[model samples]
Target: GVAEVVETFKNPGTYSSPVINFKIASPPGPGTPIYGPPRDFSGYNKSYSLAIGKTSYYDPTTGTKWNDDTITPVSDGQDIWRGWTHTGKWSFFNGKAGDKITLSVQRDAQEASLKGAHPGFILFWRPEGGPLFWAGTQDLDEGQTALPADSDTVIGHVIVQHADWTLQGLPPKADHTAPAGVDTELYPMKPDSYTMYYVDSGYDADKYVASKKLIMHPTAFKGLALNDGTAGAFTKSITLPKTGYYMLYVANVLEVDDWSVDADGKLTTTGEVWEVPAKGCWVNITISKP
Candidate 1:
């Protein structure tokens, strides 16, 4: 299959499809033989049955959680976007803490790539079904559907273009004006490979990877935080090496001032922008979650 244009490339002669036949389906829903979200979606660690200990569960003092599944309390609702069929529980809560909490999803797989969806292990806690209080999707936000694979072409292209404009630290990317290089060492621990290159200087990939600077600019206050008030739970213990994983649950958007296209189709960006390259993140595609 041909790749979609990265931000409206000027490949006048490039051929594409108005729509191609696809065989991909959204992550399976949670529960039932047919549905139940993936616990080891990272494909990196083994999914374990993480459970809450009765001794440590529920604080009689405040009815708050000291060590729970999620960081928030419980709520009753089905996921709005992905699956409207299966339901979830906020059995684990971590609100007493500052921002978020982790859960044990009954399993973990170390093979999970920073790219996610390798059948590795992950948390199935979207910001709903309860409130999700993650520091953003960590490993996922880092190694998400950047390039090579994505269910949505136009969506992914727009995301890559926006990130391409906001990235910092790494050398100039490959273009018509500078050198092109890749620095794998800069972010060896971080998800997604970081390569350095000049736009017009040809492409000194080896030199870029060996060069000293190659760190991805971290997202500022730009993280998907748990809503001001909500309840949620962690899927389980973190994978030993703790690469990135999944955390899908239900959530009602409190606001979308971030950015949205009007009926007129104007491009908009609301979250903190990053000039990241194509191989670093993914766009949320409607691959059929419900």
Candidate 2:
């Protein structure tokens, strides 16, 4: 239950990298578990590097690199794009019920290396004293499947990438379909049978804990807009629902492109252009209470 709260900033200022510790899930491979086990952060204080265009939860150990074009995009009604290939960074903070949290992500305008950097984040909450475990399938091996008994607890708990993306408006497009914006009202805290790709496994638990289920509450504004009508920036505020651990996953935003292949094997892009940064850039993240 011990987590660090981000330093509160009262005014606009230069970005200062926070001293935060995090762990990246090891890439799937022989003898490696698909989702890495959780670690105790109570006494862990080592800060990891934060880079743009990189640092995502999805990491591959061999064959195609994460950014390879060979990766197929998955459709989600409005657009299609590769999954979370850019293993992002995760930070944890403790919050209380009714806490008004304001978060903002913006590129360092004065930093030459941060040109074109667009910052984005996804937020999740875990009730105090809740269970923590990796919530994904075991499809990486032959003749393997998700743990039957454990799988039953996570049936529809999978994280829907598009739901977060559409809510944030990463591509910065206007939706004519839903005037009230994407309906996340039905977004459940924990799906029946609990089937999520990954979740926070409790600390100090067995490397392979039983009842592999972690209940995470998706915040109201699960994701803030990548730009929010302003280039390379987004900001929003929401009151937390419970007193618990609030986790934030941050990374550079990836734009989805509308692409089609012709009969001649020619590829053409006649839709929204894709914007993927080539290198990592510096971004300023400010969290505070109004």
Candidate 3:
């Protein structure tokens, strides 16, 4: 059983059909979307247009390269749109400890008439006054708290259509040698060394901290695929790791294919031909407690 929750965007701009063809003349400012409480335990389900939406505010300009060694923490600041690889929409919700949450993304047939649209999404958990929650690589001692400064390990989940479509195929690299000109001492705020742990199931918020399957890096969440006959559709049930705010990012899976970091730290796309239309894709994201 699931309840569908209504979504209120920070910038609820005009809505249009055939998302690939329609474009917003002047999109709204890249302000962070307002966080919604999990009212009555019902989750969120709503249609979004990528054409008018802004890129991920965290690292909008400098798109993260596949298998890149850096793990940029989410910052509390204004969202600027220098440029981004993919068009993304953000939604926030408050999660309680041990709550089982289900998230999904798929083509919005009513809004996006374009065929073969492939949608994907990523989930994040933000701790109190922290960018993200990480348990590190080592098992937690009794009553010990999980913190990024404790270790270089982290864990998270990235859902897409195919595993090979992104950095999922690459092996986990332990030596997170920072690139030239980057700082490494910023531990929890900006971790330099990274060790990722892939978990098979959702976490039990109350016990995750001490669980052996603890995830360390927010970017290290294991990759899950939607290879079933469905086109660009994915649904996953993950238990809340703690009682705090969580974010859901929805976008086109193919957007990452052409994304590369430029010399000026901006996101650049190669002219390579893409399987999906380049204009953008429309998706309906749904989150629920089951």
Stretches of candidate 1 off by over 4 Å are 1-224, 227-260, 265-267, 270-272, 279-290
lDDT, model 3, position 266 = 65
Model 1 TM-score relative to the real fold: 0.17
lDDT of every predicted structure (CA atoms): 0.19, 0.33, 0.34
Tens-digit lDDT track for model 1 on 1-290?
01111222222211110111112212223332221232222222222221111111111211211111121221211111111111111112112112223322211122122221101111221112122111112222334333222211111111110111111222122321211231224322122112111110000011111222111111210122212221111122222221221222221111112443355543233432222222111112111101
Q: For this target, which candidate reaches the highest TM-score against the unseen true structure?
A: 2
Show model 2 residue runs off by greater than 4 Å. 1-49, 54-82, 109-113, 128-159, 162-229, 254-278
lDDT: which is higher, 1 or 3? 3
- Estimate, for each residue in 33-102, the C-alpha lDDT of model 3 and write its tens digit: 3322221123444333342232322233432222322213323111222213124444456656688767
Ranking by TM-score: 2, 3, 1
Pitting candidate 1 against candidate 3, the one with the higher TM-score is 3
